[PDB]
Write a protein that binds this ligand. Sequence first.
Ligand SMILES: O=C[C@H](O)[C@@H](O)[C@H](O)[C@H](O)COP(=O)(O)O
Ligand SMILES: O=C[C@H](O)[C@@H](O)[C@H](O)[C@H](O)COP(=O)(O)O
Ligand SMILES: N[C@@H](CCC(=O)O)C(=O)O
Lengths: 656, 656
Amino acid sequence: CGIFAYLNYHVPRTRREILETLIKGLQRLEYRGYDSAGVGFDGGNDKDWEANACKIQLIKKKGKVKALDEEVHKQQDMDLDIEFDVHLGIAHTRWATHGEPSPVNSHPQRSDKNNEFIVIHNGIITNYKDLKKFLESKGYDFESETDTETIAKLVKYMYDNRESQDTSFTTLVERVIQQLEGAFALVFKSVHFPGQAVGTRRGSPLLIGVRSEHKLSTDHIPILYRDSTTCLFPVEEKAVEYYFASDASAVIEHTNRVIFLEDDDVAAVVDGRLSIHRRAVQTLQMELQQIMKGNFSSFMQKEIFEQPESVVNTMRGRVNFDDYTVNLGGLKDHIKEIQRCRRLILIACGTSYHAGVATRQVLEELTELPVMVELASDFRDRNTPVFRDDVCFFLSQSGETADTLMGLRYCKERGALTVGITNTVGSSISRETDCGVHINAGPEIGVASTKAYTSQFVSLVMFALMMCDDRISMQERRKEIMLGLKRLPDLIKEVLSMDDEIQKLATELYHQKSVLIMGRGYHYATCLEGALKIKEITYMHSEGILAGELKHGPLALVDKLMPVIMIIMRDHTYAKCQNALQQVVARQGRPVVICDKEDTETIKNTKRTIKVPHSVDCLQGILSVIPLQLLAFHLAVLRGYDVDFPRNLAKSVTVE
Amino acid sequence: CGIFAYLNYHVPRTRREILETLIKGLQRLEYRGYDSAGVGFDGGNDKDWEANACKIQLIKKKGKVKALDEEVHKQQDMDLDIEFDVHLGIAHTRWATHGEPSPVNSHPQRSDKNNEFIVIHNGIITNYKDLKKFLESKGYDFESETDTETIAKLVKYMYDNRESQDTSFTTLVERVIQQLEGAFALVFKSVHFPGQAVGTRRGSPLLIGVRSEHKLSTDHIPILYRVDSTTCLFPVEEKAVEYYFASDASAVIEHTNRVIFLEDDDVAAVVDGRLSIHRIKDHPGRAVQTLQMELQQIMKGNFSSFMQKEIFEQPESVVNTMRGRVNFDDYTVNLGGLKDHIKEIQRCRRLILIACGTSYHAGVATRQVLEELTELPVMVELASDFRDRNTPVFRDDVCFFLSQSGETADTLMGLRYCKERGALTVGITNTVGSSISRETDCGVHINAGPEIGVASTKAYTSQFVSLVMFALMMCDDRISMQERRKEIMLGLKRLPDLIKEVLSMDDEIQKLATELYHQKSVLIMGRGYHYATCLEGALKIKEITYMHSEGILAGELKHGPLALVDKLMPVIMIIMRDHTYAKCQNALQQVVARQGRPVVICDKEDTETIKNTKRTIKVPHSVDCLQGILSVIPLQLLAFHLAVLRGYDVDFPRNL
Ligand SMILES: O=C[C@H](O)[C@@H](O)[C@H](O)[C@H](O)COP(=O)(O)O
Ligand SMILES: O=C[C@H](O)[C@@H](O)[C@H](O)[C@H](O)COP(=O)(O)O
Ligand SMILES: N[C@@H](CCC(=O)O)C(=O)O
């Protein structure tokens, strides 16, 4: 789900300039949820913009944002020419995990048939059923099945029972959040408070961007508790443009000056002045180019072919190849205490969990500690034992995944040392961990993680290299690995140069219903992540099978018709991988083998081979997964699917 | 693959009776799979059995044992009425590895055209190439492509080059095995040692059954290192005795339940009707022990298949697993196999469960209750991956090895890995005498009865119960857990009848089987206590039905796999009444929202889901940590019925 609102205070914008700004903001957030969308602006057709703030218009439609962008336009009642000196517009894209993504269930919600209060919500209210029965008895009629409607029908209830004729919009919102349980990020708009917006959060992101050619009155808004030296506003004049949003990608295009709110911070823009109730106006360290497709037809394709660069960025300022030293600044004050601990636990979901499987072996090798890799959802169901001398890693590209974040607080309660491996600065997981590392792979827009996986991979390897930098016996092993990392970017380029060869094989498989991907050792993770990618964007039934497990049942599924992909690399499991290949062939399987270029034996005896360059055994997983990223991509194109917006989900599961 | 030899010593038997005994022995060994069988016995039709001991007749044939029996009685030049006071007959079922199936490549292999030496072999001789070259240079011509023939030719080489005219049959075999490499179980017969038998093994099971109406000299055979009445097994006051060599107790139990399990490099010899055990390496020996196995346990009975029998007898096998171990009269659990080690186990700091296939699923299915009741970390490992990674193991680790057969290579090698690192090892097995039950410090025999079916059915649920019972032992001193222990044990008390209740819904499962008859994929979704149910049910349907069933952790849906859901993909969901019930309902709403129409396995009294879901398999409620047994049985049956509908033989391996 995404939030975006545009408040232009004394900056004349026509009704078209505002709508094209709300739509453009949702496009920046569409990857967080594209099942439905909606906008909320002022209606009426009066030249004097003052006589129009009493009429709220809601345009909501099922589908992606492009379905809403067309619904907004070509309307017979809205005149897109009205100049507004002051105006507020709120927008929202929804990830409909439940029920149908109907316009009635999309946001902004309303509080009545006249739109006196409209709210956009990101999160879940854990007691909306109680709030629904209380509001129904007082005389409020509910229309939608969502939990957001109980927030709109309630802000009006606090308005219908106030004490003074002019209670601030903050007071109303403050009484609402006190009756709301769970997490939420809200942005209000009302006809009673024209131009005023109220943005409160609790367990969900919500920042406020600001732009103005004039000087700002301060850079540290003082949080208040229920004047000219308290609010953020232009000094001499009134020209200012605010940008409420749940992410920074929707605001960077307009300005890089935002104010990240905090839990229970009730921001309020009144008379064009931003004030917080119950901060720091800062510069974003992001360039627009980072969230642009460039010359690629899709974000996912860009993010795959940019892995040579993102790998370099992950190691930048951390790996020195002249003296073979590794230093992760985020762990300098804790590395000593980590080494005195007795166990590593890696906790994550989906592709981030695979990154742990991909590096478990080398972590065991170089730390000599037990390494346990856990799926966050299952980790929580079982109340896994955790102790004070456990070091718990939490791998999360977004840094907001629910099950991973709750697992973190579970481990903190038991006194464990917590470490965050994130791709998002200021995220919940990066803040609430004792320490952490920012993989610094750049923004990931494609729903299917690609560079985030390889960057997590490299990051966990760098940690392993630190944990053994005092072992004489492991010095040569460290050198081998670091020389591999030095050569890794160019080898990734070599893999990407086989893009057309991968595309050809894709034309041989796109019609199939299933594909089994088999590997072991360092490439168990490879066959799991490759199977997940193909599931996610192609919708083929791909499954990863541990090669050593074939003989124990799954091999019965292999015949001449069942597609099979095998991974056979020149590491210590080569002979065993060859035995698995022989078993597949005996069952009449005709598999595609991802192997090393020098593996002449495999290349001669196998028709379809993807020949990747050889790297260090504990790094080869990075090179062996990329062909499967590309394969998943091409298969999706052949089948007529979008690689950036796979069906039935969105990016980052921030609510469970 | 299957070995059987019958030695009647001063127990008169006709040639017919001997041949019928050999055939019957192989019939008990067919369930392992094979492609050819043969027998070796004394030829000649001289009415005096003593003059026929110099003519070894062979009858080998490609095909099933039934065809062999027809060839036996189809011999015009053979008189079946000759009575042998002393005679040795050997039989074999072959699973070809070296040399295609054929009469010549079948066992017994002979040393020359006169059959001076014959041998039956289970396994593979690795250095059979080098050995064949050597014997050919010495003037021995080979007639088969089997590695086994080198054994028959080599024993004649030692005989031909013996130093004295009276070198023992044992000495010859000792010199043969000292030149062999690989795995083998062997039974030798020769004209130069009439009436004598020599058995030896290395990495392959070989046991000896014994029967006599007279008292035996001992129940503990002492090892003889490189003779008289005080050193071997024999009937005391008279000569009559019968010996049964076999690679599987199933071929012996109908004649006797007193068996000797040989160990690696043992050379067991019967000379003058007396059994001695030799070795080349407080006094070691081999015990004559009693098996509680019965012939009825390895017979289909009234069932049409072993799979059907072993599924539907699970009420009885669960009861047998608990017999003598659970006392519902006073809420106590006592696994006798752990008496001398339960103290040390409770002082250890981590549990590691190591297994393959369905046995690994048994660990996943009990991980949570083990964590809960032991409060120790519990790590569940796939044996093949456990080996590849050189997983850290410590002296204070308790390592469990789950294995129905007790011989699975990766599981067995994992055991020896942990033993080297000083871990306390525990075997959870279902086969007496197996390697894993021997080499572990202690163990528990799940006592499910022999598993003859190709797929693990009762073994899985008996492993499940066995690990729950161990968990109940580990917390028997905790006041805070008394109630929980009582709840679990009253569930075990009621479990047999609840299984019967699930088996009474077989008709409902058949209806589901016809609905999936034409389907190529099915997703089985669950979490918590039923994660294992999803993985195990998915494996059964893969192994038995040959369709692409996959287990998906419900909590992982929104992280990618949910993209497979639509109106066409068959889905089975598990929703039981435990603490994850609300999260399972969430997963169901996520599937339905994407046009999925899943079949739900739920509690009988879950009225909400039964009304909102078309087809539901309604199982009875048990304790949360025991429901996995009830929820997996409908999936066992589903795989069974789908296979029958598609014309498959559920008792036929496939996995070759
Ligand atoms: O390709 C799949 C996605 O990348 C997905 O599996 C993702 O990994 C999780 O939904 C959470 O990821 P983060 O917690 O790292 O944001
Ligand atoms: O239906 C599944 C099979 O039974 C298979 O997965 C089996 O579990 C393994 O081959 C391990 O066998 P053991 O239990 O003998 O180690
Ligand atoms: N390797 C031997 C015996 C195989 C077996 O049956 O175990 C052969 O192929 O003849």
